[PDB]
Amino acid sequence: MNTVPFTSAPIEVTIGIDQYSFNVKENQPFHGIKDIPIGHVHVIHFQHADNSSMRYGYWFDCRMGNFYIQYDPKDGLYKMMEERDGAKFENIVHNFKERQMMVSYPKIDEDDTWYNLTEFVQMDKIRKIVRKDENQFSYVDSSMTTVQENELSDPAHSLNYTVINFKSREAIRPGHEMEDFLDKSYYLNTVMLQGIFKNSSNYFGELQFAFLNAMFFGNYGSSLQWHAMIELICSSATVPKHMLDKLDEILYYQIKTLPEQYSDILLNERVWNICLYSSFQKNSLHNTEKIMENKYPELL
């Protein structure tokens, strides 16, 4: 089990760890988060009491270093810092676990939620979408725009998701105009899976990473990307049967985890009703359709 220690909590904040969250009061004795399952990526995120504007947070993998959180009073946020002196990290963290100053990552043993939300998410691929090579962890917030959104203005602070555009030469073979626009299998399978993502596990990891940036930070452009990657599969007549089965599981847990009160903003009517009812895959996402119908029959 790994540990995210905190230098102190000088400002009142809501702290998120993966799908959990808890309130910390200003200058309450608090020195971090213990018992974090090794082996998964994690996200630790922050919403200040005084300004619900700007959620922000750090994607990280405990195998890639010792990482602590420290409040910066100049830039005014909780920052992720790495302590390379391993023996000193073991000691300060032991010092805090002895004084019982750490909240315990509250995982239920029956619970495979975070696993099933992050199945294909790799820290290596995250770092290619969020470019700040000097750090092993990656910062995201609510207001960060995407590469594609920057085409429609600080590139260092962008989310470099894979650009998907259905009315583009990439997506449409000369002389197959109707065919490829109505049945996107060639964009999905040749251009994207074989050409760019190399495999569907990388496809799925971006898809999942987009959804989670949408849910945790309200990052609008991440939501666009999530729906675009769903749409390209739903809009393809020819998809490997194993991709479909996995997509159905992937979406099922995403829909399950979505807060019911955020569905109005986060879910795109047009995309979902196409996947579930109109498109080639209308009959292939049984679990996703069952939860979408029993939980959000309104959107449909």
């Binding site: 030469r169 449409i172 105009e177």
Partner: protein, 237 residues
């Protein structure tokens, strides 16, 4: 964005544009089979592509062979219209290519947009106007070349005959839309109006009769009477 009465005059400025109507591309008769079922038989169609400023009409005849063995013909028709508009643009010299193409039905927008990706600098626009170009097949010479064609074929017309010698594009477009609207609402009366007087003739290289300015006013008035009336006969007023 979309075209309407508030930006109506834009059509006669000096930016090359084309209207595209697809309403007569896929045409069928519906009939009963020996078994008492119903079946369609297709007939030849056309794409009506029109420069509103010059009156040039690029009539692309759609021969029924283009449907043999095809499924979902109504959807295919839109895509086949886009493929043929696009080919027409590519055949034109650059200085002749339109800067805007306006579709008369919004369902054409994605099909044409997709076929015209290679022309990022041509705007593909819809319109809110309810233009009566579907009635283009009530013009006898147009209907004739369409129904006689035995193979695909692009025929060129000036839908304004010689009008621009004497009137502005604005006014020639206005006359054309009134004639076509009359044709659409009551083709028989519309046609009686136009040919009643046998001294007025249609010149071999024209589509409409050779009316003097004075006769045109009479004609235009009579077409208005028709359109209001049939709008009465229709809404009882």
């Amino acid at each position: 964005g979309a075209m309407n009465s508030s930006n109506y005059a834009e059509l006669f400025n000096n930016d090359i544009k084309l209207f595209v109507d697809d309403t007569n591309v896929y045409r069928v008769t519906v009939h009963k089979t020996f078994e008492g079922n119903v079946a369609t038989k297709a007939i030849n169609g056309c794409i009506f592509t029109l420069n509103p400023k010059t009156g040039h009409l690029f009539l692309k005849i759609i021969h029924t062979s283009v449907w043999a063995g095809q499924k979902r013909l109504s959807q295919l028709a839109k895509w086949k219209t886009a493929e043929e508009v696009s080919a027409l643009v590519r055949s034109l010299p650059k200085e002749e290519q339109p800067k805007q193409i306006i579709v008369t039905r919004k369902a054409m927008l994605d099909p044409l947009e997709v076929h015209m990706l290679d022309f990022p600098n041509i705007a593909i626009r819809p319109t809110e106007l309810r233009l009566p170009f579907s009635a283009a097949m009530s013009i006898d010479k147009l209907s004739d070349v369409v129904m006689k064609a035995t193979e695909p074929q692009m025929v060129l017309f000036n839908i304004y005959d010689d009008w621009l010698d004497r009137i502005s594009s604005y006014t020639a477009f206005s006359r054309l839309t009134l004639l076509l609207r009359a044709l659409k609402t009551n083709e028989e009366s519309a046609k009686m109006i136009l040919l009643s007087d046998p001294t007025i003739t249609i010149k071999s290289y024209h589509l409409w009769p050779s009316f003097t300015d004075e006769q045109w006013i009479t004609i235009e008035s009579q077409m208005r009477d028709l359109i209001l009336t049939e709008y009465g006969r229709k809404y009882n007023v």
